[PDB]
Amino acid sequence: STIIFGVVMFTLIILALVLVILFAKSKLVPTGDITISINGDPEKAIVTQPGGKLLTALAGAGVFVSSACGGGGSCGQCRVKIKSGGGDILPTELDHISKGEAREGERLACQVAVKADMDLELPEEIFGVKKWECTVISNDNKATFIKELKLAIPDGESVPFRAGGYIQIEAPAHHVKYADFDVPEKYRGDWDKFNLFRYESKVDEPIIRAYSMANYPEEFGIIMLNVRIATPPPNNPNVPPGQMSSYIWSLKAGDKCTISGPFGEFFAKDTDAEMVFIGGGAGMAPMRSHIFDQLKRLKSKRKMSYWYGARSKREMFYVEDFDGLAAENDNFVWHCALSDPQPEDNWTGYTGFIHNVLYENYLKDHEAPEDCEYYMCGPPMMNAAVINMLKNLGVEEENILLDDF
Amino acid sequence: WFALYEAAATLFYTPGLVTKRSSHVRDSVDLKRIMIMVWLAVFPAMFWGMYNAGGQAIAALNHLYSGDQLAAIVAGNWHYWLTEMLGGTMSSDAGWGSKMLLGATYFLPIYATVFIVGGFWEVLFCMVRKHEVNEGFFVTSILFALIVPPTLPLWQAALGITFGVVVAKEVFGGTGRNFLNPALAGRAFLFFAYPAQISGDLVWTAADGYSGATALSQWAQGGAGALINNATGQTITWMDAFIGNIPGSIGEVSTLALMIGAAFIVYMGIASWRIIGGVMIGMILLSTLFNVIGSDTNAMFNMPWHWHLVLGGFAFGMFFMATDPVSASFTNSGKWAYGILIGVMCVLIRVVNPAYPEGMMLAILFANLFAPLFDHVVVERNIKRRLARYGK
Amino acid sequence: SIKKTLFVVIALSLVCSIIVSAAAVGLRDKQKENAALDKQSKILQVAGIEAKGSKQIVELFNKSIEPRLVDFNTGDFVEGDAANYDQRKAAKEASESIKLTAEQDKAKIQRRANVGVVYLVKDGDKTSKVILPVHGNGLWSMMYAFVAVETDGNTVSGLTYYEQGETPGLGGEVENPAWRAQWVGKKLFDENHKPAIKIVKGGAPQGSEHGVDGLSGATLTSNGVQNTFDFWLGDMGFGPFLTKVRDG
Amino acid sequence: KKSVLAPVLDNNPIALQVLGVCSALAVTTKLETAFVMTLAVMFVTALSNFFVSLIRNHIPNSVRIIVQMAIIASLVIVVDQILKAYLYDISKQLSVFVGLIITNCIVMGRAEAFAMKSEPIPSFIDGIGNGLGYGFVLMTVGFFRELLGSGKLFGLEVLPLISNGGWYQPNGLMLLAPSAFFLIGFMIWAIRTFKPEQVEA
Amino acid sequence: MITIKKGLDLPIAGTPSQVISDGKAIKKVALLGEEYVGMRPTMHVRVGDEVKKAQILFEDKKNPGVKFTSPVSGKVVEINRGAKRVLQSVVIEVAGDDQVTFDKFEANQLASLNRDAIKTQLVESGLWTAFRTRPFSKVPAIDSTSEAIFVTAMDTNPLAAEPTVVINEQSEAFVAGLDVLSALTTGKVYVCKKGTSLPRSQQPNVEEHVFDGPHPAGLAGTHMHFLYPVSADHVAWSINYQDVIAVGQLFLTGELYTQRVVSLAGPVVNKPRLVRTVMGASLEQLVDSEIMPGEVRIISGSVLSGTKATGPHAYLGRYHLQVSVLREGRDKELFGWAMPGKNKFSVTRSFLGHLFKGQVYNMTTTTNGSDRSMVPIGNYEKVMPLDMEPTLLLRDLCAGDSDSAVRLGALELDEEDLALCTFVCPGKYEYGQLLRECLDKIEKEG
Amino acid sequence: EHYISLLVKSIFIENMALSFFLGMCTFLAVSKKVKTSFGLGIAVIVVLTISVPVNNLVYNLVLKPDALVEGVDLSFLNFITFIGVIAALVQILEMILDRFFPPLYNALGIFLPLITVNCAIFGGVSFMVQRDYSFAESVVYGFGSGVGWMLAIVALAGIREKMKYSDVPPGLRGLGITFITAGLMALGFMSFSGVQL
């Protein structure tokens, strides 16, 4: 008897609670599709139903916001200017946004949650993206762990980008075995020392990564780039191998990949001060464009310096180009130090890490290391060493630009 | 062993350090002096307290035992016959010296164990954490040893100080970094952990087998007319309590001694007269209120403010425990509110809390929790003026 | 899809409610028996009957204990469901309870039920002793105890505090067997038929007719226990009932 | 195994997370209550996760919070009936916290974070592990509070008491509110000095 | 007009004589890079170069357009740098009299000069570095402007010179400087002086405010709080009276005025007095044959807030108008913290010294203790007359809470404002550096 | 009257946070800034002041034994109704604030998702059932308990802010020291232990 009374009361109670909630939802949660103005252009204006994150809404339209960490608010590559709406800046956003930036209006599109009408002032790069499916031309290995990738524009013309930029390459799920990779006999022996071909990579889901360009703006038709193969740490074998760098290496002439337009905030200063470039590994790509940009695109007479930290002679590449540019123009001079020359290299120049060679050769006797732009690029270990040296030399952070990969 | 050695070397000799920047001249006041002035300020209360504890014990012993019965008791306790071997006498005709000596045998072991056990925790934390030993423990040890019954077991004192030093102070960084009062934190641990040894009628007098209520407990039972001392059968007048000729924890009985000690440090500015002024205002206002309301059943309602002052540990708590700069509010306006809360809370526990005869410790420990809030309220008001440019 | 949302909740609510209702209705009798057994054991313990296990406790309780309802106003037996009576609930309703005045409320109990429950212990076919539920406020919380009074109506056969919130060591000593065992042999009343139980502070004299040593350093709880007896043995408590016991 | 033991010391609901502390400060006075509370929390969390995961796909977001509350509340009530019918004395000792298992943050946290987006089987294992770790905190605190507070373990006299002609004087603070905080506070210190990875910056 | 009650007038022995006399001939001058907050030098000269009385020595990268000119004309004999190649000083050896010249105007026309013409002339001559923005104690940006310029015509620092004595000799220049400031300022000019009469400007913009009380009354930070409260968006400028005299001389004669009057005082100064010197004058030569034997510390500026004059830094500061020489108190005493302080000075009354009113103390550089955690015994509230909660603010600085420190008024404070709080701290903290570290964090993140 | 005694009982003598260990998770979580803790405290008062009286009506009208039908007691459907009613009211209050009271929604509506089915609310409701409280008594107890809880969280937040200058040993930093701080707070709050007001 009481069982029936309890069941009906239970069903009545739950129905009473949901009904007031559902009735409250209709009369308190206006579902009016939120309309966000993008750059103030009515055509760019996007109308979307309430809910989700600003990153998803923007991606739906023709505006694409560069994002690496995704919907986590961890990288900060999706910074947007929210003129109005969105509420106060979340505490998690402030970890990657300075207070001054918050005053201007910088916000992370992924982190911010869309709940009301907002005003946006997105830049041209986000406003418009040059998503193209370029065709792979050449994939020869420049060094032991570095490959030069040449891309053919599918739509003609050339990608609009500034020196030191990068392109966000998108790839789908794929399985690539390192044995599929093709390497020159010179670099094959070094690979055969440990026989890295045994590795196999299986990308279960599509991934998106960034790669700095290696072509100066005046170059039209072929988009030079340098790619470093991603491999498990030598001391931590229990790690899946490279997923994106492995996939790009597997490709050869005739393959196709998407660039999703250019991006990057790496550039030189339109001043008369001296430039001092220093690169390592994949970092030589942006540096090469910068040297070429300042030699013919701008024909700058400003003093130029290049120092490359290398482990062995086989690692070095593009040397002939550096020799020609240094020889053709005296304003630019290049040097390279070897941390461990091969016995057959017979190197008779600088030996050791650049962090101490550079100071003992150039910065020690220079009249103003601070009054010189520095463009650091290389493995994190070198960055920590050089930054400590540069800091011990008295160079402001604003005076030094670093692009870690 | 660098930390302890440096403290000993710096203790004997002032450091030869010189200013490195900013103000090249520094005020002569240092933490080492501030602690010693406070430590010396409680000496009059400590010395009288030893005399009082022995004097009360001797009267009770004579009043209870006599003849061969008394002699057997004396030989049965190490406190008594030790006093005899040093020239004291347990007879009623004992002079001030014997009374002071007997109290010393009851106080010094409590002070010694508290200092040794408390010191070990202080040095252990500083040694392990690579800090320099602070001198704030010197004040902490003595004050804890002066807010405990004379008959407190030594092992209880070691546990009490360990809680007061470790849990309340060291885990917060040490001297100047905690929010609670360490000495009262230790006593509150004893209060709730082993109430039988820090409450009742068998702890406040060092006479074996003697059961005698204190002035505060007696007042609650039967009001002013219930104030009688069973050791001598003489009525306890206000002068007796103010001077400190009453049973109770050593160091708190004498309000006159604490007033002399508290007056010196208040004059030197070490102890805030605002906190003391706040406590008095709180105690007077609430005690006077209870007088007006009256209570035909609760005798405590009719206790005047001046009786609240000289009874229990109110004087000791107001002077040498509520003035702890670290646990008090850091603003002058907040200090008044912090002091008033202590005075109000102490009277409330005394009157409307039958469980606890006295509440000065719980009043201070309760006030230490809200000291930041009185600071926060004052600060926010100041911030509001700043945003308005102070009406300029 | 509101139709789907209504379906999932309805089906989920029914199955969950059905299981809950079956468990609630199905196990209700068991829970009541468990609650009853807790008091039945204590009544046996004060009665001095050794029982262990639910089967023995219930069997012994039925055979040896005869609960009855007593009216405090007249101290006379009344007819009712003694086994299924809740005095605490009655004291909270004005229908079966009265509001004590300040003078009468010696034990500091807000209300006193008009009819109380007592448990007669019959060794054979005749009562040997009576157990009275006496409760009063202590220092922290209400203290409830069972007092065993012999057929004479004066001697107390035993005592047990089956519910008391007090500080262990000081006020919780009421649970101590030695202190409880001290009450055996004491006489509740005097020749004048007036309450005589006194809790002597610091220890009652040895061999005292009505002297029980008070709890050490716990005068507040000892005072509460004294008030509980001083009241329940008075006019408004079991006084009139106890007088009837003395003569039968 | 790794998932089962992960929330014991690596992702403890009370050491790392701040879920389930209401009961740890109350039902830890004795081991009998703490152990029985642990089983109730383990059983409820595991059962609630299994059912939420089973119906996770069809759960309506509009009433997902009420849906998970009902299943959790229903399971708690059934356990409550079992506790009252059997172990009635323990139910009295647990008092109202038996009914508060519905609000115990462990049940909602795992029923939402994991159960809603996991298969029924792994969700059930996760619930048991979360309760098992929460039990480790409960029993460790309960072991110290009961041993040093009463000289007993599971009601068995381990340290003879002076009241029973023994030698050990019970610590009255161990039976009060502050003792639970200090024991858990020092527990975290001990956990995090062996596992510095959890230290907060 | 305004009276300050809380504060600590240090009765350090060896006060000046308030008499202006010729100082020792100076053959070495320097510019101290560290003296300027947030200044990254862009060197415009090298060792061995020949500079003139106003030739630029270096620029500020983070304050473009601000030129630091050479105080005197000579040869750059060294560029002392330090850790991180931080520019400790740029030393010039005086030899010659060549000097740059600028436009000169009659005193009557100064008030009517265009604001931009005033700014460029000050920037060109390098006198623009005299100004300091209170919120961060940085030289004002060239394009920036402020509605309140505070002229500190009072010197309450211990052993400090009397501004009235100095100004009375340069009455015309001071009035001329005020007129230029009146035109430069967007709002008003506050001439914060004492009760003593000073030359007055007829311009309605200039206003005279009288401050009375202990030392804190004489600081520009104290004046700004009482007159023009400063915040993130309310910026005020500070300039000492001597610099104002230079401004007047600059616009009257068209030549940079570098002569200054500084009080060479201290316990070990045989004949303390005011001495005419030059900006950046080498203190080693200035105090030559004027100090008692023994190990002493030469300090540029007040002992409360000054710079140690050793090695590269042994030159008068840009904003320092006083030289204090103190004994080195490295001696260790037995139970020195327990003795009665007959000769010990303290804000608290725990020493016998306070009983003997009117005493003068031969203070040394000893810290009088070791570094300990702050134990607030009310000392801070006794020396801070501003409407702030000093104890809570100092706790925020110690903890590094920039956000809370700003809310409590850290922006309105300069390192000098906390000199007394450093002086009276039982824990022996250096709140000057803590505030500077906090202010830098606010600027960088801002 | 009797109501004023009840209000003081629910705040000081009986504190939900420290004396009952209710809502500790949200009491040891948002106890980092005074303002945010202040916001939760006022929000908990609103939820309690509306949950306790509403739950009192339902219990005395539906779940009370021998209330709807003689001989049948629906007490076994106690937790479902209390937890269900609490969840509904908190959500309803949040949505109306976000629609009609923008400024309050940020001040209060932000924390309601945290108070949803919180131990403080359920415990305060459950203790009402364990006693016999009239509608007037229930509302005062609901408001009183919430204020008492707000007092503990704000006091803890103030102490945690004062601890900005503390040097907590690593491992005790964050949660570990907060437990010890909460324990010390409980020790002080035990001053009102034996007060029958």
Ligand SMILES: Cc1cc2nc3c(=O)[nH]c(=O)nc-3n(C[C@H](O)[C@H](O)[C@H](O)COP(=O)(O)OP(=O)(O)OC[C@H]3O[C@@H](n4cnc5c(N)ncnc54)[C@H](O)[C@@H]3O)c2cc1C
């Ligand atoms: C602006 C910008 C420019 C860049 N330019 C270049 C460039 O020119 N060239 C270049 O090579 N890179 C560049 N990068 C870095 C690039 O994003 C990738 O790090 C790189 O291309 C390798 O891709 P990956 O995803 O395989 O690396 P990851 O896999 O993310 O690298 C992680 C490391 O662990 C291994 N690993 C693989 N899978 C896993 C896993 N699941 N868990 C743990 N470890 C794993 C990898 O082998 C690698 O050693 C740039 C990045 C940025 C932001």
Ligand SMILES: CCCCCCCCCCCCO[C@@H]1O[C@H](CO)[C@@H](O[C@H]2O[C@H](CO)[C@@H](O)[C@H](O)[C@H]2O)[C@H](O)[C@H]1O
């Ligand atoms: C037992 C006796 C002691 C306890 C009783 C006394 C408690 C006193 C503390 C009350 C709580 C603190 O109250 C504090 O009030 C200040 C005003 O100064 C408020 O100050 C703040 O208010 C609003 C938010 O409401 C903010 O936007 C504003 O910037 C600021 O002024 C704090 O937000 C609040 O936290």
Ligand SMILES: Cc1cc2nc3c(=O)[nH]c(=O)nc-3n(C[C@H](O)[C@H](O)[C@H](O)CO)c2cc1C
């Ligand atoms: C006036 C004054 C009173 C003090 N009172 C106490 C006290 O009651 N208990 C204590 O442990 N320390 C006391 N100290 C020492 C110290 O300040 C205290 O332990 C702080 O809590 C340490 O942070 C006192 C110090 C001073 C100057």
Ligand code: FES
């Ligand atoms: S995508 Fe990384 S911060 Fe938004």
Ligand code: FES
């Ligand atoms: S279990 Fe988290 S609030 Fe109670």
Ligand SMILES: [K+]
């Ligand atoms: K009392």
Ligand code: NA
């Ligand atoms: Na006294």
